[PDB]
Amino acid sequence: VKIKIEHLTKIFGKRIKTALTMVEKGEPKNEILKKTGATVGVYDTNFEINEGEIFVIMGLSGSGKSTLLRLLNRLIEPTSGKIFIDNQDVATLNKEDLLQVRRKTMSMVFQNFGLFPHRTILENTEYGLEVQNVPKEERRKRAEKALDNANLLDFKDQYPKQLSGGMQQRVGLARALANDPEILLMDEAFSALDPLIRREMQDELLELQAKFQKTIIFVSHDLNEALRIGDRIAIMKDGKIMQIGTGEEILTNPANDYVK
Amino acid sequence: VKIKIEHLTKIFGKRIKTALTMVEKGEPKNEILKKTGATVGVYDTNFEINEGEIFVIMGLSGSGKSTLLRLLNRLIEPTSGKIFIDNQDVATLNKEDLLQVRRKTMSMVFQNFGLFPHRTILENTEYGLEVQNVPKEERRKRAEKALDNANLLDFKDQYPKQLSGGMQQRVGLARALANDPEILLMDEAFSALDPLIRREMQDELLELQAKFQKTIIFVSHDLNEALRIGDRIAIMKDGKIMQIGTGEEILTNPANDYVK
Amino acid sequence: GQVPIANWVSSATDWITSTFSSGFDVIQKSGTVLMNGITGALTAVPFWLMIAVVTILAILVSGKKIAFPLFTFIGLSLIANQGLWSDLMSTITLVLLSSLLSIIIGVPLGIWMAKSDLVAKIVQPILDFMQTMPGFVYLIPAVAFFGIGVVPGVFASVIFALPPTVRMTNLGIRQVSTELVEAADSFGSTARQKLFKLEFPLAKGTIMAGVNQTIMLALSMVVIASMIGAPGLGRGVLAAVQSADIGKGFVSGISLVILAIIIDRFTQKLNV
Amino acid sequence: GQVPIANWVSSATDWITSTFSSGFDVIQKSGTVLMNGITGALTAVPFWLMIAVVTILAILVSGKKIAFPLFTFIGLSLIANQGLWSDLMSTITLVLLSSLLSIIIGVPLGIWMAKSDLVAKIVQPILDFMQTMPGFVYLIPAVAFFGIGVVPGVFASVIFALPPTVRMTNLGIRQVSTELVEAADSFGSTARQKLFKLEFPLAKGTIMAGVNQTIMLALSMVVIASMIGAPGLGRGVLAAVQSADIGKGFVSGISLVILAIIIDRFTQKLNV
């Protein structure tokens, strides 16, 4: 296995330890988020992600689905928990080791494409390397190959504002890929596209994964697209994982009608 | 009769006389709507309104529908035409004559209720009198009787921000009535309401009109309410009146098939 | 080499101040009498009863927060103890008169700019022209006409503080939603009933922001006019920076700072 | 009666300017040499080649509109003809240095205020405290330390013009959409690659507005510092309002107005 989680916890607001332990009683989060006012992101999630798979993550919009991601790479400081990768726990790292992690191992993809409008394609896509102090020629070549693998090297001098939602997403994915990461995080990557280009990006992602294998984590809200991508799906609600079913999620329905 | 119209028209933009001779001829409208932009609001309308009736007016955006009202009031200066009312042409009146016209004969009701939020209801409702320099006691009693006729005298000290769309419209109509005019103008009076209160206000309006006789001219979108209330309906589009059918418009339909 | 302007300007100024002296002498008399009247009689009364009034007023506009009242009391009283109460009564009549004149001149001009659009197209860039330029150059047109004294400081202040009042007035007038104006015009409001009954009561909250800028600008300008001879705390400051007596200068500057904080907090809390 | 402050303040100021003179003498030397270097060598060169450069630059930033170029030419040339070119080269090095220092001091402080929220909660009200107060009181802390001269005018200007730069910097930093920051942090940007690569290039347009305010504030403050001895056109104005020679004062004021209009139009058109 490439990833191993151990009791991941994220709680906002003050009363850090007091609220953490008072909720550690295991009560439904609704009570503490409604009355006591202590917001909750997750609660004691202990799962894992094996190499060369797709651990999709569902959850109604507002159920702490992307917070788990943003915790994996520490875009939000997790209260307590452990994320063992490459025999390394991330939460117990200084800025240097964490930066090297983010540089070489993990890299995200964003809903609104998280693109620098003031920088052109061959300028953005190379960011993942520019940050690494990479030879301009080498990073340029890597960017251009990451582009032509998506068939956009022709537009290597335009600006994002002059492109399409699907093209912007493909450029974001090229930026994520040029760094050649062992892990690929995707947070609602296709939540702003049309169904047909959505499905097209899905097929592109699958063909690339099958061709180039690497661990993927994926957030989404449709079960159909998921099962189209789902190698190990795991839905979430109230900030709590409930299952890790590939073809059984839709079979077994533990305390959930949303599964249909 | 009460009203008589004489070649009423309103044209925006410069090229005033040239555009006027252009529109008076019957030239195409979309041509000039897309060519020069000196938009057209009205098309040489020559109709009339008899005393004690309801001359509803219909049409969609760009129909110059509401514009006809504001022209009758002179809230927007008409390019050419005449409105003979009480043996008075309004377009050829000095300031004070039009002032007294607006103060006694005509008075409007507004889509968004046109209410002074900074003033109390019994303070608003009396505006129609305050502007006339009326004895405080006299205008106060008139306003109170007007609220009584609508059964909202209890709320004579609240503020509009604390009320409902229905009560706001009722207070606007009370403001219109307190002047005891001979004409009642409305501009999408019930566009911000729901069907129930819409129809309730419609019924109350017809009840008052039959009990208290006075000329009305009405603006609306839907034909159902027009037939519920309208005594002489008038369709309009591209700033041109189509007909004046009470129960014939449902029959004679040169593209007036909106009845269903 | 050519240097013709100075002569033309001094000639024109002599012509004005000679052919119009009938007005300038009257203005000088009125200014000096107003100043020495509302700075000695309307003010300059027990300096333990006025600071108390202001303290309780701060309490009112603050409710529970005691910082601002503590400042007013440990402020104005600080001034008095330092012996600068008679120079604060002045520097207040000055900003008072400057703000009143700037209002009287702008608010009407703001209405005129709101009604006519060409007037605005004219003046608004002129107002940015007058609010970008340094204010120190508003003294020439002051000592040239009224010489040194009080009324020149007042003139510089009113012509330095006017812009924001005018701008925010124009705004608050031509930002009231056209529907209310339609309503008030349908019942025959002849631009004078309409104004008072509808527009001002709704613009107030926008205008008064412009006025609370006007006041600070007038304070700044009278402190600067201290160079001319406009009395008050400014003179103190001036003397200091001319004689490097940092004690007197600092106490006068801190008095001005206190007055400024007080005026800001008041003029703000009395706007919301 | 008690009047204790002045003594305490003068004592503290003597203590500072005595125990730190090692720094103040160095600052005085640096200021005077910078001024007399970039006002006589980097400038004070043919007054028919510089106005032409500025005219063509105005043409560039204006395209077809000829009003602003006509002003630059019939402006600066007007100054020169009036014999005030050596006092405009000064009054430019002064605003130049004041703006540079205010930038160097604010932009970093603006970053620090954007990262930490408590720093902002501290400073922003302090910045309104410093932008509400009259600027004439920024002279005491200038003549108290650096006496009269150029560097005190520069100090007053940098401490009078700083606020807007800081505020708009903080804005342009903590108004760039958090998603881009997430993107730049996911690829390991250590707050120095992130800053230059993402935030500045996006804030620029907001910052430079604060800076184009800083420049005008520095101009105002050096004209006011003319009282201290900061050279330039201000002195002229000053002399006039001290001797009532309205010709010289008016020509210097019109030169300042011209410089102000030019700087405003430039610093604006070079922001959009």
Automatic annotation (TrEMBL), chains A, B:
Keyword set includes Ligase: no
GO MF annotation list: ABC-type quaternary ammonium compound transporting activity; ATP binding; ATP hydrolysis activity
Catalytic activity, reaction form: a quaternary ammonium(out) + ATP + H2O = a quaternary ammonium(in) + ADP + phosphate + H(+)
Domain ABC transporter: residue ranges: 3-260
Broad class of enzyme this protein falls into: translocase
Topology of this chain in the membrane: Peripheral membrane protein
Any Gene Ontology CC annotation: plasma membrane
Domain of life: Bacteria
EC number(s) per entry: 7.6.2.9
A Gene Ontology biological process term: response to osmotic stress
Chief localisation class: membrane
Alphabetically ordered keywords of this record: Amino-acid transport, ATP-binding, CBS domain, Cell inner membrane, Cell membrane, Membrane, Nucleotide-binding, Transport
Compartments where found: Cell inner membrane
SUBUNIT field: The complex is probably composed of two ATP-binding proteins, two transmembrane proteins and a solute-binding protein.
UniProt record similarity statement: Belongs to the ABC transporter superfamily.
Protein name: Quaternary amine transport ATP-binding protein
Part of the intact protein present: 3 to 262 of 408
From TrEMBL, chains C, D:
Subcellular location(s) per record: Cell membrane; Membrane
Domain ABC transmembrane type-1: start-end pairs: 88-267
Segments crossing the lipid bilayer: 38-60, 67-85, 91-114, 135-162, 215-234, 246-266
Recorded superkingdom: Bacteria
Family of the protein in this entry: In the C-terminal section; belongs to the OsmX family. Belongs to the binding-protein-dependent transport system permease family.
Name by which UniProt lists this protein: ABC transporter permease/substrate binding protein
